[PDB]
Nucleic acid binder design. Structure first.
Lengths: 59, 75
DNA sequence: ACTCTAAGATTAATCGGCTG
DNA sequence: TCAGCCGATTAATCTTAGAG
């Protein structure tokens, strides 16, 4: 397993920061992002879990 | 993440820490017990919590999580 | 090249809705 | 009922690809 592409990350951060008010995408948006980034929905789901926590522990 | 324009609820601290990793033996059995019977009876519940030195809640949670993991591997 | 950081994954344990 | 099931998530951790 290798890390995500510089672009996939950009795509995810865009979504994340674009929704700082509730970074909890629906299974649809997740499926959406998943295909956009060319990664599984699990991978997106993990990415958001890790993103939220690591955002918080650094406020 | 140094500066959030505001502190939204989700950024708050939920959960009114520790993650007791489980020994290889414990996990090997719970797993062993899982291939045998996907759900648990109050009976099996106690005898196991007993054998592997764990609370009942832990055996209950262990199987709940194992079921979701089973669901997602589809297999 | 070589080394720690942190990205990505895994999993206890929690929150809450819902039912058998 | 009301304890256990599902589902999604939290948070601690494990792994180890790579930023530095």
């Amino acid at each position: 397993r290798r890390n995500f592409s510089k672009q996939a990350s950009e795509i995810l951060n865009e979504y994340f920061y674009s929704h700082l008010s509730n970074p909890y995408p629906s299974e649809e948006a997740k499926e959406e992002l998943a295909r956009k980034c060319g990664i599984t929905v699990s991978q997106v789901s993990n990415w958001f879990g890790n993103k939220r926590i690591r955002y918080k522990k650094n406020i | 993440k140094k500066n959030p324009p505001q502190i939204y609820p989700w950024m708050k601290r939920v959960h009114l820490r520790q993650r007791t990793s489980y020994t290889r033996y414990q996990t090997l059995e719970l797993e062993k017990e899982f291939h045998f019977n996907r759900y648990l009876t109050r009976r099996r519940r106690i005898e196991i919590a007993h054998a592997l030195s764990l609370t009942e809640r832990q055996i209950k949670i262990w199987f709940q999580n194992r079921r979701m993991k089973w669901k997602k591997e589809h297999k």
